[PDB]
Amino acid sequence: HMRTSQYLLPADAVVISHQLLLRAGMIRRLASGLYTWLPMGLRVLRKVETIVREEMNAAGALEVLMPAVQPAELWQESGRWEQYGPELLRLKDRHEREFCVGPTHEEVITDLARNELNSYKQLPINFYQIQTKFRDEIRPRFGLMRGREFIMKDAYSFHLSQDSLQQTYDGMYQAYSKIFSRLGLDFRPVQADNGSIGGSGSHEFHVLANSGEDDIVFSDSSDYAANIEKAEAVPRESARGSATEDMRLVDTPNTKTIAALVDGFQLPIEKTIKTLVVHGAEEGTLVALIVRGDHELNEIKAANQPLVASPLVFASEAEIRAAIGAGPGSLGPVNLPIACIVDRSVALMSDFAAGANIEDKHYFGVNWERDLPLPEVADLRNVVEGDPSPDGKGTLVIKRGIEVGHIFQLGTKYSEAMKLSVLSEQGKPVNLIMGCYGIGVSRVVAAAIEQNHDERGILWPSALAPFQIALVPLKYETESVKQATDKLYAELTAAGFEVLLDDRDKKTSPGVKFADMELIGIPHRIVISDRGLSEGVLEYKGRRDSESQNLPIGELMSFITEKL
Amino acid sequence: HHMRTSQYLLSTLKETPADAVVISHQLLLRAGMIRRLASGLYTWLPMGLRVLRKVETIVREEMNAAGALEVLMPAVQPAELWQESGRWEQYGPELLRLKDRHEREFCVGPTHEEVITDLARNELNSYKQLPINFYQIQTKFRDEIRPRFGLMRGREFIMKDAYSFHLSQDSLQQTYDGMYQAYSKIFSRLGLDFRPVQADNGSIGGSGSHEFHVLANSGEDDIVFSDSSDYAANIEKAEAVPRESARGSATEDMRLVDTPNTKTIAALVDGFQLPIEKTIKTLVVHGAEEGTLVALIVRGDHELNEIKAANQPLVASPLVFASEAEIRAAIGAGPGSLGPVNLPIACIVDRSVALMSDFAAGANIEDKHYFGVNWERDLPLPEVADLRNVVEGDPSPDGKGTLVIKRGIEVGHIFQLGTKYSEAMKLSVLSEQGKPVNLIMGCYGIGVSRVVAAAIEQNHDERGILWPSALAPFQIALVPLKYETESVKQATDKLYAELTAAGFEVLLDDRDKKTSPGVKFADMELIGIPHRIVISDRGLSEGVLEYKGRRDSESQNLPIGELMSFITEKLS
Ligand SMILES: Nc1ncnc2cc(-c3cccc(S(=O)(=O)NC(=O)[C@@H]4CCCN4)c3)ccc12
Ligand SMILES: Nc1ncnc2cc(-c3cccc(S(=O)(=O)NC(=O)[C@@H]4CCCN4)c3)ccc12
Ligand SMILES: [Mg+2]
Ligand SMILES: [Mg+2]
Ligand SMILES: [Mg+2]
């Protein structure tokens, strides 16, 4: 008998999921980013794991279990030993051999693949695991959301052709949809950054919650959906305005922000531009990226520009001063001695202000072609709320998302570097084309609470509830109650329901018991008492019900079976 | 959606390393169940993972039935907890230590005593909560100095580790007996021939422990049984009593003899035609009093038991043998010339040595021995104790029968820990009376990875693996002949669907004719699948399938109409 004598058990906790996971006796902190699953919490995790496993299996993926401790030599082959960065936990064994604790498993599976895959007849094939990762998050926080040790489902698929990858990638995308549907989450798949302008080689899956760290973008009139990183921006204006002012050089002291320029000289913000200087791909060069004053530079879009070094490095003040002859706050496209790219919206601007590339000065009345030639145009900005959908169908809305899934097309990145090759039917060597697919299993648990909670505590989706029914007997010590209760437990448990019986003594009031069952998020409660048994009635309340109701002892099993 | 050999069996060319010297390691490799990543680190391949999960499930069912609560604790653990217990320093070089990016110190958990104790001192705040038993099935790491024998001595491996908490020793005993009973059901259900034995607590510590062993010829432990009672013990723990009932009369006078180039029992025996049962070995070890030495004496055919030796109050624990320089300074003679006569250090003799007569021993003079030594006449008998290992045929210490020594693979070990952690880490709860009680603890471990391998060590034949029923990765193998032909394909796929629907685990061999039927049949047997069904045109035209059991010598025809009834019968 699962009893409450066994199972039940701030300041550091800021987000709701962290607070309620602690209070509901689901997890306990061991150290920074390291949490034990308590008995109640583990039940939830297992239900997530099961559903994930079920759908992965149904999509044709084969479950493996790879080691956490991995030899550095494999990581040196991929170059990620160095390149992965300080989240990689590195160590040495007693023989001074070097290893990491796995943040992910691309290298391990690739090593497996090149030893186990030696025929085209084995392909396509998709391996996955549900296994504990380590990532040395610099500032572990938000409970399970940014842990160091966490549970991930990671899958890896191997292919002979790009078309074969697409099929599996689609099937994985479809499997993710089912998973998150069955977990009863309000979620969305979105386009994500694949490291190029255009393409659909990456997708994310987000639990919609107001605490989400990602901004995700949807058309209100189409299927368009993307992370703001990936979301294409097109201008609200259809044409460039005609020149109505002459360009003039103006003294602008203490004017190093858009706000200073707007308020100082009573300009509309739509008539100002920012110039950000970044390193170019060509050694020792700089590029100027220009967005409108009320817009932000998208750093993903910036880096993805051929001309711009990837990853993105902003120029130092000294670099900018040596190159241009003035500093941030006084920069612009007029008499600019470095390469320049302007945003689509900037290209349609007119009679606009800009730094003069002379300290504490701006040009007003700048017009393209008349005053200077228009530089290369590109999509450089973040979309904003209400912008046109880039597919040409509707306007954009911006919601917050908690990423719980992320899929990728890898190409031959790993297969080239680690020499994973298979002979085709024709006998031509083929570097295997690869995809990989990840779900933050432990993040999912937290994300469910972020989305689903109330003032009484956790509201589980039905598939995640640790127990289905809570039996609350009043003065279980009385033997008449303690026979009805135990009969009830037996029947319900026999009918294949998960039941928790509150076995606690009189020192725990019925009120506290009711609060705990709701805090933990049990969807159904039944109350037994002498008063109730006398009249042959049981008291039943739903988790999201306003008031309790009385049910005849005989008709409960039929009633409860309906609810569940 | 079928489970197919083209996916599951992976490469034809298997790892065949030089160190693959045990059968479990070889067959696990050859049947595509594990693959090596590095020393002591193995991936569970799809076939192999299926077997692991079946062990875990049964383990989990019985832990839950014994009322233990499943948790899941981190692998990476802060050093500060290990410093509280003292094990940060004391555990030794099998503890894998590391630093994070902030220079903070951690280990990867070899076991979780400190973590579960730290949990208890935060979660256990009332006597009404006790007794309570927590367990997990979770990946450990131990930096085994020479990883070998595949899964048996890995570095990363799966353990089910449980920990119980108690206000009294009587409470602990009840739970400990429950876990003992629960372990028996697990290994019974896993279809293993196993035995629980009395054990030493070892480095885990405490007083009172048992091991569970799978009986196998490749077992690293020596396990001792009576031939007439239920007496069972690891040779580490097994009490030794003499075969001799009393001390024989002195027949020889003691005399000094020159014995140059005589520094082994064998050399003494061969040199002087002495029975080995009339010789003694003197081992000099460090005493508990710092700077002191103790001589331990066993009969020349016997071995010193190092656990028994360390447990002697006079002898330092852990056991340290004295150097030749220490011995020569102390005694004036070296190894090969040592004995109890005119010995200027403390001495302890084995029980069997106490009953010896007319024996030979080193004279504590270089290159000399005494022959015809007799206790009391020539020198007083020093302290007596149980110092040796038992041998085949010795009296059972319980009094019933004579001992027999078998070889065992340890797959479980349970311990009574007392308060060694709860005292060190300040874990206390008030009793009903309101008095502070340091919680009394026990811990229980099953080597889940080792179980998989141990099953193969015990159960195999010339054709490959023999899985016990509950462990087989699949129950049925469908081997269609000309799966490409639509008739056989339709029948095969139909057959897969029906069997799957009944709840059987089926593997379909979808490989083309480049893999011959003979290789297919061998592959299926090597993996250890208990039942196969062959589908062919010649069969379907007669309305029969060709069945064969893994343990059968011949096939038999099976009418299609009686499929479920026949196969159901076989799988029961
Ligand atoms: N600190 C953390 N705490 C809790 N959950 C976490 C989940 C991920 C996570 C989850 C899914 C996918 C990814 S990923 O990095 O975008 N992708 C991968 O790792 C790929 C896909 C699977 C194999 N490699 C990260 C990263 C950090 C986490
Ligand atoms: N190198 C290895 N490879 C594979 N499996 C292994 C299992 C154990 C193992 C298994 C069970 C119990 C123990 S133990 O050390 O005797 N006891 C404990 O660790 C106790 C039991 C619960 C936790 N502490 C070790 C030790 C090394 C192993
Ligand atoms: Mg670039
Ligand atoms: Mg300036
Ligand atoms: Mg001692």
Coordinates of all heavy atoms in Angstrom, one line a residue, chain A residues 286 315-328 331 337-338:
Chain A
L286 N 36.6 44.8 -40.7 CA 35.4 45.1 -39.9 C 34.3 45.3 -40.9 O 34.5 45.6 -42.0 CB 35.7 46.4 -39.1 CG 36.8 46.4 -38.1 CD1 37.0 47.8 -37.5 CD2 36.7 45.3 -37.1
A315 N 33.4 44.7 -32.7 CA 34.7 45.5 -32.7 C 34.9 46.2 -31.3 O 33.9 46.6 -30.7 CB 34.7 46.4 -33.8
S316 N 36.1 46.3 -30.9 CA 36.5 47.1 -29.7 C 36.3 48.6 -30.1 O 36.3 48.9 -31.2 CB 37.9 46.8 -29.2 OG 38.8 47.3 -30.1
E317 N 36.3 49.4 -29.0 CA 36.3 50.8 -29.2 C 37.6 51.3 -29.9 O 37.5 52.2 -30.8 CB 36.1 51.6 -27.9 CG 36.0 53.1 -28.0 CD 35.8 53.8 -26.7 OE1 35.5 53.2 -25.7 OE2 35.8 55.1 -26.8
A318 N 38.7 50.7 -29.6 CA 40.0 51.0 -30.2 C 40.0 50.7 -31.6 O 40.5 51.5 -32.5 CB 41.1 50.4 -29.4
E319 N 39.5 49.5 -32.0 CA 39.4 49.0 -33.3 C 38.5 50.0 -34.2 O 38.9 50.3 -35.3 CB 38.8 47.6 -33.4 CG 39.8 46.5 -33.1 CD 39.2 45.1 -32.8 OE1 37.9 45.0 -32.8 OE2 40.0 44.2 -32.7
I320 N 37.4 50.4 -33.6 CA 36.4 51.3 -34.3 C 37.1 52.6 -34.5 O 36.9 53.2 -35.6 CB 35.1 51.3 -33.5 CG1 34.4 50.0 -33.5 CG2 34.3 52.5 -34.0 CD1 33.3 49.9 -32.5
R321 N 37.8 53.1 -33.5 CA 38.4 54.5 -33.6 C 39.5 54.5 -34.6 O 39.6 55.5 -35.4 CB 38.9 54.9 -32.2 CG 37.7 55.4 -31.3 CD 38.1 56.0 -30.0 NE 37.0 56.4 -29.2 CZ 36.2 57.4 -29.4 NH1 36.4 58.2 -30.4 NH2 35.1 57.5 -28.7
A322 N 40.4 53.5 -34.6 CA 41.5 53.4 -35.6 C 40.9 53.3 -37.0 O 41.5 53.9 -37.9 CB 42.4 52.2 -35.2
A323 N 39.8 52.5 -37.2 CA 39.3 52.2 -38.5 C 38.5 53.4 -39.1 O 38.7 53.8 -40.2 CB 38.4 51.0 -38.4
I324 N 37.7 54.1 -38.3 CA 36.7 55.0 -38.8 C 37.1 56.4 -38.4 O 36.8 57.4 -39.1 CB 35.3 54.6 -38.3 CG1 34.9 53.2 -38.7 CG2 34.2 55.6 -38.8 CD1 33.6 52.7 -38.1
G325 N 37.8 56.6 -37.3 CA 38.2 57.9 -36.8 C 37.2 58.5 -35.8 O 37.3 59.7 -35.6
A326 N 36.3 57.7 -35.3 CA 35.3 58.2 -34.3 C 34.8 56.9 -33.6 O 35.1 55.8 -34.0 CB 34.2 59.0 -34.9
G327 N 34.1 57.1 -32.5 CA 33.7 56.1 -31.6 C 32.2 55.8 -31.6 O 31.4 56.5 -32.3
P328 N 31.7 54.7 -30.9 CA 30.3 54.4 -30.8 C 29.5 55.6 -30.3 O 30.0 56.3 -29.4 CB 30.3 53.2 -29.8 CG 31.6 52.6 -29.9 CD 32.6 53.8 -30.2
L331 N 28.6 57.0 -35.2 CA 29.0 56.2 -36.4 C 27.8 56.2 -37.4 O 26.7 56.3 -37.0 CB 29.3 54.8 -35.9 CG 30.4 54.7 -34.9 CD1 30.7 53.2 -34.7 CD2 31.7 55.4 -35.3
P337 N 34.7 54.1 -44.1 CA 35.8 53.5 -44.9 C 35.9 51.9 -44.7 O 36.9 51.3 -44.9 CB 37.0 54.2 -44.2 CG 36.6 54.3 -42.8 CD 35.1 54.6 -42.8
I338 N 34.7 51.3 -44.3 CA 34.6 49.9 -44.1 C 33.4 49.4 -44.8 O 32.5 50.2 -45.1 CB 34.7 49.5 -42.7 CG1 33.5 50.0 -41.8 CG2 36.0 49.8 -42.0 CD1 33.3 49.3 -40.5

